[PDB]
Amino acid sequence: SDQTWVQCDACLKWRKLPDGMLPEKWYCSNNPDPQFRNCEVPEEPE
């Protein structure tokens, strides 16, 4: 791979991050990708 994923501490979904990227707690709202910046967006498959 290797694709980095981070887990949102509010909704528990896993979100892809860019290679080479963090706060103790992370939330969808902090996503650099605006497409996955809301907890309502479904989790991407592996």
Partner: peptide, 8 residues
């Protein structure tokens, strides 16, 4: 943050 790597 909690992170994991998958083999893309």
């Amino acid at each position: 943050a909690r992170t994991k790597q998958t083999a893309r």
